[PDB]
Amino acid sequence: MVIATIQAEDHSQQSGTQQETTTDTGGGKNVGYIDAGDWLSYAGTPVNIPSSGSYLIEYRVASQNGGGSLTFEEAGGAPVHGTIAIPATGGWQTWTTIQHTVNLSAGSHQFGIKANAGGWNLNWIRINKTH
């Protein structure tokens, strides 16, 4: 089941990005202007992970030219949970949902996202239990 949908713009701390209106389905905002080394923290909204095992993490992303990469991690930078490439969608507001599985320990987590490479926008993240 879905543990949580986290809107990208609901970060508690960030470095180097900016919010903008999104035209994706449902409206609201996206995080843009993401460059290599930029980061977002969700430490202000802890997410309880009910059991140790596999979780499918989904990212609602847009990218004009491609080349982007992110790491899904614990806020602060360690441990790291996984990395995923962001494909080109051909527009800054042409959206798609990408997916990877990570393995998480049970308990209270504070998540963060680090941009390894830029060129992508983020609308929201969804964390799913798949074990």
Ligand X SMILES: OC[C@H]1O[C@@H](O[C@H]2[C@H](O)[C@@H](O)[C@H](O[C@@H]3[C@@H](O)[C@H](O[C@H]4[C@H](O)[C@@H](O)[C@H](O)O[C@@H]4CO)O[C@H](CO)[C@H]3O)O[C@@H]2CO)[C@H](O)[C@@H](O)[C@@H]1O
From the list 28, 76, 90, 91, which residue makes contact with ligand X (rule: CB under 6 A)? 76
- 77 touching ligand X, by CB under 6 A: yes
Q: Any binding-site annotation on 29? A: yes
Q: Report which of 84, 87, 63, 86 is spatially closest to residue 72, judged by C-alpha positions.
A: 84
Q: What are the DSSP E strand ranges found in 1-131? A: 2-7, 13-15, 18-21, 29-32, 39-41, 47-49, 53-63, 68-74, 80-86, 91-104, 107-109, 111-117, 121-129
In the set 62, 75, 104, 122, which binds ligand X (CB under 6 A)?
Answer: 75
What count of other Cβ atoms lies within 10 Å of the Cβ of residue 5?
12
- Does residue 85 touch Cl ion according to CB under 5 A? no
Query: Is 24 annotated in some ligand binding site?
Result: no
The binder of 123, among ligand X, Cl ion, Ca ion, none, by C-beta within 5 to 8 A per type, is Ca ion
Q: Does the protein bind Ca ion through residue 28 (CB under 5 A)?
A: yes
Residue 10 sits in the site that holds Ca ion (CB under 5 A) = no
d(CA 18, CA 90): 20
Task: Collapse the DSSP code of 10 into the 3-class scheme (helix H, G, I; strand E, B; otherwise coil) and give the result.
Answer: helix
CA–CA separation, 83 vs 90, rounded Å?
A: 22
Residues making up the binding site: 7, 9, 16, 29, 33, 35, 38, 123
Which chain residues interact with Cl ion by CB under 5 A? 35-36, 118
Which chain residues interact with Ca ion by CB under 5 A? 7, 16, 28, 33, 35, 38, 123-124
Which chain residues interact with ligand X by CB under 6 A? 12-13, 37, 39, 41, 43, 73, 75-77, 112, 114
